[PDB]
Design a binder for this molecule. Structure first.
Ligand SMILES: Nc1ncnc2c1ncn2[C@@H]1O[C@H](COP(=O)(O)OP(=O)(O)OP(=O)(O)O)[C@@H](O)[C@H]1O
Ligand SMILES: Nc1ncnc2c1ncn2[C@@H]1O[C@H](COP(=O)(O)OP(=O)(O)O)[C@@H](O)[C@H]1O
Ligand SMILES: [Mg+2]
Ligand SMILES: [Mg+2]
Lengths: 96, 465, 56, 503, 187, 468
């Protein structure tokens, strides 16, 4: 299987409710662990683009897999859970 | 409430329906005689979280319901935890009834913020002449207690607890990571005899947190955090100069490596966990000096393969602020405590921290001891008449110094019948300075053996002849 | 003890020979016994009913 | 009679049938069977296959349950039915196991009939906590002068027998087992020690030789030999230490004193590594799984000295570790060294240097220390230990000791004589009074004039003389437990007379 | 992610995820029976020479296969969520596993309506009176407002006894009884 | 039952059945092969598919090719008719002398003898080699080890043992060449033909041969030891005669298992061995034991990779052998042949209650003086030999004499050294080494003790050198 071949995503696809959620600019955490969070969605995310989680932590889109996005979390992964909403910032990771 | 879907080894996977618990959350398994606490470590997806167990996983059936506590492992904390033995999950294991306290605290807490950190190094006076003179303990620092058995390590621990309780009015916590059950019981009864822990009234000074070797690696990985939380309560809610003990840090590193290996994570060099540095930092950074108080950790260290360059001792030394080594040769010489005056080092042994006078006195003492080592080599090879008068006087002064480093202990009064002494730092510095100045060169060598302040040394000299 | 051990060994050999013959004969006999197979088809149906009554 | 008793047995056996929980074997290979179904199976629960082989459900994966096979895997086919026993693995326990050789599951393999065990005890019970235990004080006499003198072992202490292959570890364990005969057949109950020898990964011929050696010495009547040979499957070798530990826990809980000797715990670790790797559990250093320190830790911690409130029993553990080229920094040796209290170190160099047993007193340690000794043995052993340490300090100059200081030569002579005293023959354990008498004759400088090569002959002759003519003094030392001043003077007179008459 | 309705069997595998998702989706909107019928009829329209080919062919674009299947399921009257399932399978490349998904969903719905067969394997079948007697006793075993199916087998190796697996129980009174004679052989 | 091949990855062949799934350790016949290809079922992969190990080359196999099942493990032709006949891993005769017409066939996989069947008695097997008969004596009906590196002399030593013991042995003998050179096998076959041990003309042969050499695939080299020990098992159990089982080299069994392990689908163990190393090694070794029915004297040659005895493959074998003989490269480089290490060889029967007080005392004195010589070599390295005391010079000289007197020419080694082969009786060895320990020959040069038999030959060589 694959990361996005999970039962929840399959249910969302078959039920036809894949229209309300903004998969183009936001995403939901599939699996957070080992300091790398897999995100389903963010179809318009860029490589190395900084994405901010629901809790407030910010992450860098390292791996852009065909079905998911591997985001490294700049903080403690305890604050990130499965189902958390990840939204783009529209910018490669930068610093003031 | 989730259900167990995998019981592979000590790794238990629980699938939840309504709400997935966050990482580092305590899950309590239902249907077991003894509490089985699962700590969430990963979110595997499909509403499944992979957890490590704090107890044996036998008898677990796929489908057993597990309740999310809603927080990390919370332990009973407060003044009533003194004189009690509690495991990682906080249950009392001294068979003295429940530990009745007012509040509980999660073991997993963030390190104090940058502003909360103190900006001034300060010496924690332990009342021991050798420690306070040559290898002072920084307040909120970490101490690497080298040496094992036969050098009175446990006596030193008890005396440190008693001195810190009497001088600074701060309690102490002993967190035994991977401690032998027999040695745990022996230490418990030895502390009971020493009086640092009392079973009658609430005058105990030590809160024991024992993670035995027969417990799963997850338990030994969090016993240190449990003891550190017990110390954090005293530091924050009471503003005391707490004293934390970890015996030993190497078993904490080993437990972390085992836990990481159980989770199928590719090991780092010399078979250690990838998160060795980060786990060690998360454990150690909570041992610091906040504005309310401070926590000072005296961590025993075992060097694997006697290699100081191994990843575990190197990572541990990265956080140490001082080292105290108990040499068996010094114990055979008859000097108690057996702290080696030369091999023991302190990072704060700097004029800008301890003052010019203290630094000069300590440096002079160490130089005289090294010269004594050289002259002892010469005496071993050549004859004692070969060395000059200056060499003989240096030998005499160094012998007086190394016998003055010996000190009676209050925790050992019942055994040896010699009253214990809590020597202040000023008295130690003044006595050693006067000894170096040759003021007491006429006194005999035994005049300085097993005494407190130098006034007791001159009194003992008067007692002799 | 010589005689005692010899007698014990002979007893054990006789026991193993007897059980060998029994185990090599019973299976073939009951395989050739259809009149006992048809009732063995119903030795447990009443036992099955009793077991289900215990369950229910 | 034989036919009648056979028919009585078969009529006594009842062919009951009942419901069960069953599953099919998806894939069987290398002694690991992946079983579909079996929803209500506990972790580490015994399950039996259709072929009759038993198993242990270790991995409770979602799709399948991974079970280890207690036998050859050729008898398990894909699709076979795996019934559920419903209980965690447990072994027969009690006094009935004494004198019997049993497998990892307690089944008799000595062909002496079924075990009349009345009680059944699990193999994964937790060790006693801090409170139930007490400090080790009672000695555990191994019968070896070197052990009982310099590396004493108490009842309730995990002492390691570590060393390379062909160094005498098994010999040390077997003479420790033999020595306990003088206490068991006696009358003092609180001194009897029931030995339990667990053989792991050893050929059946070696176990048979050991059993014959014990039987010739009349030591089997209080000894249990749990055998998990190399032919047996890896799960049996993994379980054998736990089965022996439970068999010793029975004696420990009932106030009796048991001795458990895990021979070649390294082979048990190898078997557990094989099981873990075949179960696809993640590996670690030297391919061992992460929970390999847990394996030995939760086993050895069950060795303890219970207080009077819990009965006053004990369980002394003597694990055996086979180091490779004396490398104690390896994974399993480091684990076992950390877990146990002390170790008895054997070296090939010392073995072939004439120092048999090959105990290296410099490296052998005992954290329980002198607290596990009788007063007389402690009194002689402190002096002997100090003198031997002084000798080992100056042992480098023995090659050119002729042109040395008088003190150095005296130390060399005393150390050589003490080392000659430490030598002992195989399968010849010594009573505590005999050892204390020999060590007294040595440390008090009654051998300095004697030739170093003649110490062994003098030792044997002196032992014979004191046993024959001066049995009263030895009995008084044994009963009192200390070498009092009057006994000191009597020993002085006896050793002086024998030394004068030796030539 | 909204919580999904867990099927009773909870089968596992690559087909397991798809079957579980389909069961959860069809439990919502209460279309389990219609989806089951569409699955049992979609397998037949997945075994034609034209349909079975060009989907196991790895050198045809997935887009082509997706459309070839979208128009097929549109003209096959399928306009609920099963068309979405077929489209998802085509997109993810699990088309070859579609019969497995159908079988898994069929087993789930069967456990939702029927029960695990009470497999009996003793010998050549006995009289029909004994067959209905054992069916009635199996029904009494179940006796939970449900009806079980039956599967009778023949085994010459099994002696006069019979082995019955009523669900997941698998009682055994068969040739193993003569195996239990080893107790006499042992002691 | 007919199955189809679905995977031919390497020497591992996956066969899918539909009707009857063969049990593990079953011989599978591959149809359509010009020769006989046998696959042994190793795993049940599920979905009615079994993973098998090939006993011959896998070249030419095609997916879908039919495979039969024998219904039993590899069965070899066994009996008294296999004497003098070389046979393959699967039992086929490879000596071009026709089929091995025998009335018995035995599966190479069988259960180890039970605990009650073990025989505790142990005599002493005098071999005529000074080091072996002195320090690590061999026991009749006991397992013997020949640990050694590459080129230390394992093959020559086992050939000399065959020459000394097999001819003098009343019972039968079996040689099982496992993963060795075919040149050595041909040499042994011709030597035993010309020595009368194997007689082609009539049925008076006393040695059976089982040969799977290093050219065979790893599946074959992992089963030839089983075939040879199965022939030995028949000669032990069905017939009450004593059996000699010479294996060279047994390490290739472990090496073949390791070679097949990776493709079998196993996580590698330490140093890249299979996780089931100890299990399979024990399963093989326990079968080679002396039972109450008969006795098998096994002389196994064990290859030690890189001369590192801490390697798992030779380390695990130590627990399986009563008497062990470690040949060291350092001793061989000194010219002392055999290269047996006096301070590393061990024997279970080395005990005063078994070999007598005199033998044990002589052996222990030799070992002690050699250890003291090892200790003194370090001093000699820096101090210098001329600077040693007069007392330890005598010890060094005696140790040199003992080291040279341990050496002994072999009949099988006449082609290399040129010396006549010697066979020293046990009492002669004991007397000679006792005399050397006593210093009775401190006046003879150390050269006189090199490559000689009895001590009388040593004194003869001494006086002959003095004559020149
Ligand atoms: N005190 C002793 N004096 C003389 N020989 C001894 C002594 N102890 C043991 N031996 C001998 O040393 C050899 C090895 O002994 P033992 O089997 O106990 O060693 P080990 O290291 O435990 O063995 P292994 O590693 O093969 O399991 C045997 O031949 C034994 O008789
Ligand atoms: N008496 C002897 N015993 C053993 N080896 C000898 C002897 N004499 C000479 N040698 C040399 O030792 C070598 C051993 O070869 P071999 O037995 O093939 O070693 P291995 O079997 O370990 O590869 C031979 O090449 C031979 O030249
Ligand atoms: Mg041994
Ligand atoms: Mg060779």
């Amino acid at each position: 299987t694959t990361t996005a071949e999970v039962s929840s995503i399959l249910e969302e696809r078959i039920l036809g409710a894949d229209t309300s959620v903004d998969l183009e600019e936001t995403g939901r955490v599939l699996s957070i662990g080992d300091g790398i969070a897999r995100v389903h969605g963010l179809r318009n995310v860029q490589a190395e683009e900084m994405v901010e989680f629901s809790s407030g932590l910010k992450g860098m889109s390292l791996n852009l897999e065909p079905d998911n996005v591997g985001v490294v979390v700049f903080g403690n992964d305890k604050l990130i859970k499965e189902g958390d909403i990840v939204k783009r910032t529209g910018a490669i990771v930068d610093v003031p | 409430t989730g259900r167990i879907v995998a019981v592979i080894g000590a790794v238990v996977d629980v699938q939840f329906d309504e709400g997935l618990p966050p990482i580092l959350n305590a899950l309590e398994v239902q249907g077991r005689e003894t509490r089985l606490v699962l700590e969430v470590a990963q979110h595997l997806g499909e509403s499944t979280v992979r957890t490590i167990a704090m107890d044996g996983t036998e008898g677990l059936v796929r489908g057993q319901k597990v309740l999310d506590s809603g927080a990390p492992i919370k332990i009973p904390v407060g003044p009533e935890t003194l004189g009690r033995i509690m495991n990682v999950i906080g249950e009392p294991i001294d068979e003295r009834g429940p530990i009745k306290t007012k509040q509980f605290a999660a073991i997993h807490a963030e390190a104090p913020e940058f502003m909360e950190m103190s900006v001034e190094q300060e010496i924690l006076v332990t009342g021991i002449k050798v420690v306070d003179l040559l290898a002072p303990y920084a307040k909120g620092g970490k101490i690497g207690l080298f040496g094992g058995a036969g050098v009175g390590k446990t006596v030193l621990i008890m005396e440190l607890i008693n001195n810190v309780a009497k001088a600074h009015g701060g309690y102490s916590v002993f967190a035994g990571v991977g401690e032998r059950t027999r040695e745990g019981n022996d230490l418990y009864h030895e502390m009971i005899e020493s009086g640092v822990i009392n079973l009658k009234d609430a005058t105990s000074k030590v809160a024991l947190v024992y993670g035995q070797m027969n417990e799963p690696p997850g338990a030994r990985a969090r016993v240190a955090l449990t003891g550190l939380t017990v110390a954090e309560y005293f530091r924050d809610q009471e503003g005391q100069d707490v004293l934390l003990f970890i015996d030993n840090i190497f078993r904490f590193t080993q437990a972390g490596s085992e836990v990481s290996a159980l989770l199928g994570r590719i090991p780092s060099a010399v078979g250690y966990q990838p998160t060795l540095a980060t786990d060690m930092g998360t454990m150690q950074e909570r041992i610091t000096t906040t504005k309310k108080g401070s926590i000072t950790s005296v961590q025993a260290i075992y060097v694997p393969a006697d290699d100081l360059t191994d990843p575990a001792p190197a990572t541990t030394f990265a956080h140490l602020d001082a080292t105290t080594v108990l040499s068996r040769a010094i114990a055979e010489l008859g000097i108690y405590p057996a702290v080696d005056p030369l091999d023991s080092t302190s990072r704060i042994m700097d004029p800008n921290i301890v003052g010019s006078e203290h630094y000069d006195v300590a440096r002079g003492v160490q130089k005289i001891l090294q010269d004594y080592k050289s002259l002892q080599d010469i005496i071993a090879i050549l004859g004692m008449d070969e060395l000059s008068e200056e060499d003989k006087l240096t030998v005499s002064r160094a012998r007086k110094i190394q016998r003055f480093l010996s000190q009676p202990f209050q925790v050992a009064e019942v055994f040896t019948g010699h009253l214990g002494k809590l020597v202040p730092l000023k008295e130690t510095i003044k006595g050693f300075q006067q000894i170096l100045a040759g003021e007491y060169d006429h006194l005999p060598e035994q005049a300085f053996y097993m005494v407190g302040p130098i006034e007791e040394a001159v009194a003992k000299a008067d007692k002799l002849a | 003890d010589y005689h005692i051990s010899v007698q014990n060994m002979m007893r054990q050999k006789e026991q193993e020979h007897m059980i060998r013959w029994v185990e090599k004969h019973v299976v073939q006999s009951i395989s050739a016994q259809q009149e006992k197979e048809t009732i063995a088809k119903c030795i447990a149906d009443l036992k099955l009913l009793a077991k289900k009554a215990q369950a229910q | 009679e034989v036919s009648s008793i056979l028919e009585e047995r078969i009529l006594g056996a009842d062919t009951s049938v009942d419901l069960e929980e069953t599953g099919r074997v998806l894939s069987i290979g290398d002694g690991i069977a992946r079983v579909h179904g079996l929803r209500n199976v506990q972790a580490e629960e015994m399950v039996e296959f259709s072929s009759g082989l038993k198993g242990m459900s270790l991995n409770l994966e979602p799709d399948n349950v991974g079970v280890v096979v207690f036998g050859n895997d050729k008898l398990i086919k894909e699709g076979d039915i795996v019934k559920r026993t419903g209980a965690i693995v447990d072994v027969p326990v009690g006094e009935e196991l004494l004198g019997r050789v049993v497998d990892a599951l307690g089944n008799a393999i000595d062909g002496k009939g079924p075990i009349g065990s009345k009680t059944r005890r699990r193999v994964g019970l937790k060790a006693p906590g801090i409170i139930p235990r007490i400090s080790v004080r009672e000695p555990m006499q191994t019968g070896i002068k070197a052990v009982d003198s310099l590396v004493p072992i108490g009842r309730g202490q995990r002492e390691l027998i570590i060393g390379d292959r062909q160094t005498g570890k098994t010999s040390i364990a077997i003479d420790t087992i033999i020595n306990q005969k003088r206490f068991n057949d006696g009358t003092d109950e609180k001194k009897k020690l029931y030995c339990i020898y667990v053989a792991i990964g050893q050929k059946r011929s070696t176990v048979a030789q050991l059993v014959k050696r014990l039987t010739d010495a009349d030591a089997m009547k209080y000894t249990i030999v749990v055998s998990a040979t190399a032919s047996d499957a890896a799960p049996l070798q993994y379980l054998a230490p736990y089965s022996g530990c439970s068999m010793g826990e029975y004696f420990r809980d009932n106030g009796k004193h048991a001795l458990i000797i895990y021979d070649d715990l390294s082979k048990q670790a190898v078997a557990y590594r094989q099981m873990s790797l075949l179960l696809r559990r993640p590996p670690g250093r030297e391919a061992y799984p992460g929970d390999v320190f847990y394996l030995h830790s939760r086993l050895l911690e069950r060795a303890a000295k219970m207080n009077d409130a819990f009965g006053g029993g004990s369980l002394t553990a003597l694990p055996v570790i086979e180091t490779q080229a004396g490398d104690v920094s390896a994974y399993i040796p480091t684990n076992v060294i950390s877990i146990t209290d002390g170790q008895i170190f054997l070296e090939t160099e010392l073995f072939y240097k004439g120092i048999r047993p090959a105990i290296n007193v410099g490296l052998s340690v005992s954290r329980v220390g002198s607290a596990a000794q009788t007063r007389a043995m402690k009194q002689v052993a402190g002096t002997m230990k100090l003198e031997l340490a002084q000798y080992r300090e100056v042992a480098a100059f023995a090659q050119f000791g002729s042109d040395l200081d008088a003190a150095t030569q005296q130390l060399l002579s005393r150390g050589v004589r003490l080392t000659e005293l430490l030598k002992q023959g195989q399968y010849a354990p010594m009573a505590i009074e005999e050892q204390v008498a020999v060590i007294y004759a040595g440390v008090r400088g009654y051998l300095d004039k004697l030739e170093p090569s003649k110490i062994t002959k003098f030792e044997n002759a002196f032992l014979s003389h004191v046993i024959s003519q001066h049995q009263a003094l030895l009995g008084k030392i044994r009963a009192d437990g200390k070498i009092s001043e009057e006994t000191d003077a009597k020993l002085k007179e006896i050793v002086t007379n024998f030394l004068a008459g030796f030539e | 992610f909204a919580k999904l309705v867990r099927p009773p069997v909870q089968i596992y595998g690559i087909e397991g995820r798809y079957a579980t998702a389909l069961y959860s989706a069809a439990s919502k909107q209460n279309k389990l029976e219609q989806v089951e019928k569409e699955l049992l009829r979609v397998a037949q329209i997945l075994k034609e020479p034209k349909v079975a080919a060009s989907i196991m062919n790895p050198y045809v674009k997935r887009s082509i296969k997706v459309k070839s299947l979208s128009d097929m399921t549109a003209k096959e009257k399928f306009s609920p969520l099963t068309s979405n399932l077929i489209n998802l399978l085509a997109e993810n490349g699990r088309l070859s596993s579609t019969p497995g998904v159908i079988s898994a969903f069929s087993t789930m719905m069967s456990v939702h309506r029927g029960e695990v067969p009470c497999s009996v394997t003793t010998a050549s079948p006995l009289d029909e009176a004994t067959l209905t007697e054992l069916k009635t006793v199996l029904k009494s075993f179940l006796s939970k407002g449900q009806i079980l199916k039956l599967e009778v087998k023949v085994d010459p190796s099994i002696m006069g006894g019979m082995i019955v697996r009523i669900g997941e129980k698998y009682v055994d009174m068969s040739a193993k009884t003569k195996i239990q004679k080893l107790s006499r052989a042992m002691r």
